[PDB]
Amino acid sequence: ISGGSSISMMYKYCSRLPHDEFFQPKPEFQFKPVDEFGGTICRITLPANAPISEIESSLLPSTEAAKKDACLKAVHELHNLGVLNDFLLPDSKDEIEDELSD
């Protein structure tokens, strides 16, 4: 699987993180630490300005990764729909490196 540019789009979603200086106020991030019996639970919730994007479910034993899941799944949930693309930065903001993003 040779990806890159596709990430720039997926990473952008993660870029919504707080630690991110380029992250705008609107998105939300929440991590739920659980036993290895269910890795970690990633809880993401977007503003009313956004329809879907929420992703709650474990998959990774790590928060950073667990979040990546919901974050990744969130992108898809937004990609599959993408009805508020007007609320989110278009490809214009996607004009960045795959690594740069997120």
What does each C-alpha distance from 59 to 47, 55, 56, 69, 85 come to in angstroms?
24, 11, 10, 7, 27
CB 34 within 8 A of CB 41: yes
Q: Cα torsion at 3, 24, 76, 101 (round to 10°)?
A: 0
* Other Cβ atoms within 10 Å of 62 Cβ, number: 15
Distance CA 102, CA 100 (A): 7
Give me the domains of the chain, ranges plus CATH numbers. 1-102 (3.30.160.380)
**H/E element holding 60?**
strand 55-60
Structure method: NMR
Distance CA 66, CA 59 (A): 6
Q: What DSSP string runs through 11-36?
A: HHHHTTSSS-TTPPSS-EEEEEE--G
52, two tokens: 């879907």
Q: Which one, of 70, 55, 63, 53, lies nearest residue 32 by Cα?
A: 63
Q: Is 92 helix (H, G, I), strand (E, B) or coil?
A: helix
Q: What sign has the CA pseudo-torsion 54, 77, 12, 70?
A: positive
Distance CA 56, CA 42 (A): 5
Distance CA 40, CA 32 (A): 6
